Amino acid sequence: VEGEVQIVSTATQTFLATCINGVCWTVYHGAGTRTIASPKGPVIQMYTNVDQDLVGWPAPQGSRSLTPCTCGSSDLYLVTRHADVIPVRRRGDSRGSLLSPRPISYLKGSSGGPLLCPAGHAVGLFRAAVCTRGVAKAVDFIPVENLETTM
Amino acid sequence: APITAYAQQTRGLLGCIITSLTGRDKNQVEGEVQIVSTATQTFLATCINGVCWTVYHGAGTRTIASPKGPVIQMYTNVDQDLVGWPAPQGSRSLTPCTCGSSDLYLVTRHADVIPVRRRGDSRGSLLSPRPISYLKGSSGGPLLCPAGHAVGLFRAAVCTRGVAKAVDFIPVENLETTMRS
Amino acid sequence: KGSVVIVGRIVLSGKPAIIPKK
Amino acid sequence: GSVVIVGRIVLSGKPA
Numbered sequence: 554v555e556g557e558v559q560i561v562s563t564a565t566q567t568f569l570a571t572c573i574n575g576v577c578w579t580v581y582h583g584a585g586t587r588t589i590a591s592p593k594g595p596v597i598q599m600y601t602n603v604d605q606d607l608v609g610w611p612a613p614q615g616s617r618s619l620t621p622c623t624c625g626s627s628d629l630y631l632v633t634r635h636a637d638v639i640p641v642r643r644r645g646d647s648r649g650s651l652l653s654p655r656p657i658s659y660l661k662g663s664s665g666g667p668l669l670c671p672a673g674h675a676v677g678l679f680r681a682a683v684c685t686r687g688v689a690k691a692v693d694f695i696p697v698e699n700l701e702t703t704m
Numbered sequence: 705a706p707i708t709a710y711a712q713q714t715r716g717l718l719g720c721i722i723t724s725l726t727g728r729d730k731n732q733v734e735g736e737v738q739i740v741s742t743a744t745q746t747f748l749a750t751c752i753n754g755v756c757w758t759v760y761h762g763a764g765t766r767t768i769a770s771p772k773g774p775v776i777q778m779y780t781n782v783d784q785d786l787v788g789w790p791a792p793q794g795s796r797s798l799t800p801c802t803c804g805s806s807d808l809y810l811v812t813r814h815a816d817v818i819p820v821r822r823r824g825d826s827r828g829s830l831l832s833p834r835p836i837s838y839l840k841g842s843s844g845g846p847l848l849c850p851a852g853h854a855v856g857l858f859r860a861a862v863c864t865r866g867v868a869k870a871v872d873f874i875p876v877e878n879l880e881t882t883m884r885s
Numbered sequence: 886k887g888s889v890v891i892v893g894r895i896v897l898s899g900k901p902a903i904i905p906k907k
Numbered sequence: 908g909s910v911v912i913v914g915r916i917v918l919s920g921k922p923a
């Protein structure tokens with residue numbers, strides 16, 4: 554079995570990475586310009602974009618790529634590091650509101666994860682939770698266009 | 705919840721041929737859509753409300769191999785291009801769509817779900833045209849609404865120059881009519 | 886004429902899962 | 908430092 558989402562860690566933290574179009578994408582604020590581990594040694598980033606908080610390495614072993622969205626749906630679904638699916642209503646090019654707010658803890662360690670459309674296709678990469686007093690009611694994300702554009 | 709799917713091959717060429725002649729399949733069944741094979745072609749069969757449905761142009765009037773030997777078709781409609789056998793023990797059924805959505809999702813033989821926009825009672829357009837070779841083997845497969853309920857069964861591709869821009873399907877309504885006849 | 890044979894299956898009821906280690 | 912993969916998620920829930 555192959556996975557589209559990799560649960561990754563640095564010495565500092567843990568977050569997610571998502572494979573889209575043969576590239577393993579994640580958040581620059583998690584990975585930085587760090588290299589990714591492999592049985593043959595570290596492999597450097599193929600793409601680094603501090604501006605968009607985006608970095609990508611060649612897709613690792615045991616992974617499969619996600620297909621970008623082409624249906625423009627606004628009914629998104631965020632997948633957490635615990636494999637929880639959270640329905641998100643898209644509010645803007647890179648913003649969406651949780652249909653049911655969750656404490657920040659519930660979304661911790663999930664940045665880099667995917668935001669899927671009703672077809673399970675990649676709409677964006679979870680960039681950061683937008684919360685009010687410890688309650689995430691919305692999220693910031695990197696649209697696939699940026700990824701497709703960066704490539 | 706987003707529509708995701710996965711495929712698993714349960715048997716090979718020779719086992720398929722033996723089972724075809726024998727008509728006795730002792731394999732365990734799981735899933736809503738079965739990957740089906742005659743001696744000439746492989747396509748899909750979708751279980752909806754307890755009945756395993758597929759395309760007549762694929763199954764013809766054949767029986768389906770089961771652990772109790774071959775099972776005769778429950779329904780046959782050369783005009784609607786449908787055939788149906790009792791859903792195999794182990795399968796899970798989809799239920800008809802009741803929300804009238806026009807945003808549909810076709811599940812292919814390779815377990816990919818592609819979006820299609822309903823442009824008629826039996827037609828929808830691919831938002832992202834693909835070569836027909838991709839759609840090869842998907843006849844009888846399901847067209848789902850955003851909620852995951854059955855809207856129709858993939859019938860034929862509307863292609864030109866080898867690329868499919870639209871699809872032709874048998875809406876779930878024809879199913880009720882076939883059962884009623 | 887032969888019987889139609891099930892040679893595989895496509896599962897729609899699966900939900901995101903962490904691939905277990907072995 | 909290097910980013911290491913500590914686990915994987917399969918969106919379809921494929922057991923296989």
Ligand SMILES: *[C@](O)(C(=O)NC1CC1)[C@H](CCCC)NC(=O)[C@@H]1[C@@H]2[C@H](CN1C(=O)[C@@H](NC(=O)NC1(CS(=O)(=O)C(C)(C)C)CCCCC1)C(C)(C)C)C2(C)C
Nearest residue numbers: 745746747761836839840841842843859860861862863872
């Ligand atoms: C399905 O039976 C299957 O997968 N089984 C085979 C692979 C083992 C198969 C799906 C393949 C689509 C790529 N469907 C068919 O074989 C059906 C049956 C016959 C012809 N086709 C079919 O898909 C045709 N398409 C077709 O006939 N389309 C139209 C006409 S058209 O495409 O607009 C044109 C006039 C030829 C340009 C008629 C039907 C309604 C849609 C338009 C192709 C094999 C050419 C893709 C059935 C009975 C429809």
Ligand SMILES: [Zn+2]
Nearest residue numbers: 622623624670
């Ligand atoms: Zn989409």
Ligand SMILES: [Zn+2]
Nearest residue numbers: 801802803849
């Ligand atoms: Zn519906």
